Design a protein around this ligand. Structure first.
Ligand SMILES: C[C@@H](NC(=O)CCCC[C@@H](N)C(=O)O)C(=O)O
Ligand SMILES: [Mg+2]
Ligand SMILES: [Mg+2]
Length: 466
């Protein structure tokens, strides 16, 4: 019965979609320790977002599942009888889920505490982490997109999925011949606009491109939008996430009866301040609840921000150098053999990262018996589930198969690299698996990945729903 399972995974791995590719495939039973299958298990490969598994376990060991993140507004002293302050500071401490609403409610607290004129300048303080925005070997041409957002301690998160350091751009058509309407979203009055886009005839071709040219803070739009087209939206990153958070915070202050008379910029609390007055503050949800949008949708910003938060807890340094050692140590203290690991970031966007399929499975076994095991496995995408917040990146995969609603696994796809790793819980034993593909030269081999997980689910004692 175990001899036939091997013949089918051998046959699945023959597919022409794996032409010139190296693939690590390892399957293990969690109750016994029986290695049911092993192919190139100790070979070093790139993981893409499967590197988030390692990060997320280390964030729970170091910071704990009870951990939350704070944000504050500070002045040198309280406001007077006239209700005047000088300079104000908005100070961030690594919150990956700070919304525009959250800023509005802090701007109400500021007015409630007796302020009605900010006499000086307003400063944004992100000095809880270093000001290294991107990783060394990330590619400059990817910088306009939400997954390559710059890293900061003061960052504003968009929408219910909490995409940091970005703004939503909207393009609406007018009459044929007239320029199209571009909205910059939150970054209105912060980022610059370069609108070169026109409206085309009804039924003409959509040729619209939205860019942020490298080393600028400009949204550049070109092409035609047909008069009969549904309007277009796109998330785009900005330069200095903290300066935007600043810009968005004085708008909130102004909307709330507090007047800012000076300028807005970056800067930290002067230190010659002996007793700063805290006029407003906010507290995030706990890390266990934050792990859900993070792991279900594969958030890169969250992972890089959590690394730098590990550097603070272990060393007092908000840095990739220090946090990456913290990840490595915490993984060891849990029992993982980290001989084959090369750690260059938390998200897995770096092509400097290397894992092995034996290492991922080792992690999945150790995380299975850790005190925080249920909050860990809840964050992982479930196969074939409609609900975005239950299915995540596996929402439209393995539906109508024996794996629907059963297989819990993390994904990770890039040019030349793709991976699926997680749990197959069932009555015939709870399984752990890792599939890692490198070197393929077409579409990512997602159906080969699906095919194995489905076959393992039938082996674990499941059937396709009807
Ligand atoms: C998970 C995240 N995207 C990525 O990691 C996509 C990485 C693309 C890198 C690109 N230079 C390439 O090589 O194709 C996202 O879609 O949010
Ligand atoms: Mg604005
Ligand atoms: Mg089932």
């Amino acid at each position: 019965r175990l001899t036939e399972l091997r013949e089918d995974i051998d046959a699945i791995l023959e597919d022409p979609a794996l032409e010139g590719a190296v693939s690590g495939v390892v399957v293990v039973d969690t109750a016994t320790g029986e290695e049911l299958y092993s192919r190139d298990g100790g070979e070093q490969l790139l993981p893409a977002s499967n590197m988030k598994l390692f990060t997320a376990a280390a964030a729970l060991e170091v910071l704990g599942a009870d951990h939350s993140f704070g944000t504050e507004v500070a002045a040198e002293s309280a406001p007077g009888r006239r209700g005047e302050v000088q300079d104000l500071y908005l100070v961030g401490r690594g919150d990956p889920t700070l919304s525009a609403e959250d800023l509005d409610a802090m701007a109400a607290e500021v007015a409630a505490s007796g302020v009605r004129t900010v006499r000086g300048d307003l400063y944004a303080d992100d000095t809880w982490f270093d000001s290294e925005r991107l990783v060394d070997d990330w590619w400059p041409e990817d910088e306009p997109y939400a997954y390559s957002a710059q890293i900061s301690a003061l960052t504003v998160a968009h929408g219910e999925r909490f995409d940091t350091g970005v703004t939503e751009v909207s393009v609406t058509p007018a009459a044929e011949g007239e320029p199209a309407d571009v909205d910059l979203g939150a970054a209105e009055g912060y980022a610059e606009l370069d609108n070169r886009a026109v409206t085309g005839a009804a039924g003409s071709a959509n040729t619209l491109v939205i860019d942020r040219p490298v080393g600028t803070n400009t949204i550049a739009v070109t092409g035609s939008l047909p008069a009969d087209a549904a309007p277009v939206t796109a998330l785009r990153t900005v330069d200095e996430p903290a300066a935007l958070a600043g810009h968005l915070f004085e708008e909130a202050l102004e909307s709330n009866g507090v007047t800012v008379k000076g300028d807005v910029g970056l800067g930290g609390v002067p230190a010659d301040w002996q007793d700063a007055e805290v006029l407003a503050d906010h507290t995030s949800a706990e890390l266990s609840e934050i792990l859900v949008p993070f792991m279900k949708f594969s958030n890169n910003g969250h992972a890089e921000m959590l690394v730098k938060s590990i550097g603070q807890e272990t060393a007092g340094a908000g840095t990739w150098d220090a946090g990456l050692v913290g990840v490595e140590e915490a993984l060891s203290g849990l029992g993982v053999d980290t001989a084959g690991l090369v750690l260059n970031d938390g998200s897995g966007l770096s092509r400097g990262n290397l894992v092995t399929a034996d290492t991922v499975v080792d992690l999945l076994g150790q995380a299975g018996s850790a005190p925080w095991a249920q909050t860990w496995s809840a964050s992982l995408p479930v196969a074939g589930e409609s609900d975005p917040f239950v299915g995540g990146t596996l929402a439209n995969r393995m539906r109508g198969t024996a794996a629907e609603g059963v297989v819990e696994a993390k994904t990770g796809t890039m040019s030349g690299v793709s991976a699926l790793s997680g749990y197959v819980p069932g009555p015939e034993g709870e399984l752990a698996f890792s599939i890692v593909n490198n070197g393929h030269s077409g579409p990512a081999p997602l159906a080969v990945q699906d095919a194995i997980a489905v076959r393992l689910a039938e082996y674990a004692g499941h059937q396709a729903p009807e």
